[PDB]
Amino acid sequence: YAWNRKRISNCVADYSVIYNFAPFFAFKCYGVSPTKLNDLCFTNVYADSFVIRGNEVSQIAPGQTGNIADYNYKLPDDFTGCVIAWNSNKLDSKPSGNY
């Protein structure tokens, strides 16, 4: 509900080093290919970081309805960019319950 947005500009963006930072499976992009992110280049890059559950990862996509996509975080229909999601059991889970 209070997702952070970070503006990235005026720098050289190497996207191959992202695979070392987090243990994610797929670099799921929508308007661009994940392997062509080093040749072409953009004007501004925004990073939106938040935490959801596994039933709701499919809702972070252009043109979905539900709980996150309708009330918390909505993506535009003409959205270009990549969505990266990975499990966080070992750091963002407690036996008493996260609140």
């Binding site: 987090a22 243990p23 994610f24 499976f25 990975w86 499990n87």
Partner: protein
């Protein structure tokens, strides 16, 4: 073993087939039927049907 689910080792086997141009050497377990000529039949010659 303490790494994430994306840093786990993975064993990959790639089965690279090539389509039939030469005589076929490897084929699946299909029982061959005796040949009949001069009749309208369905034929299965080395995988191609008609």
């Amino acid at each position: 073993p303490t790494y994430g689910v994306g840093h786990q080792p993975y064993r990959v086997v790639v089965l690279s087939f090539e389509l039939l141009h030469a005589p076929a050497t490897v084929c699946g377990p299909k029982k061959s039927t005796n040949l009949v000529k001069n009749k309208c039949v369905n034929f299965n010659f080395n995988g191609l049907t008609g």
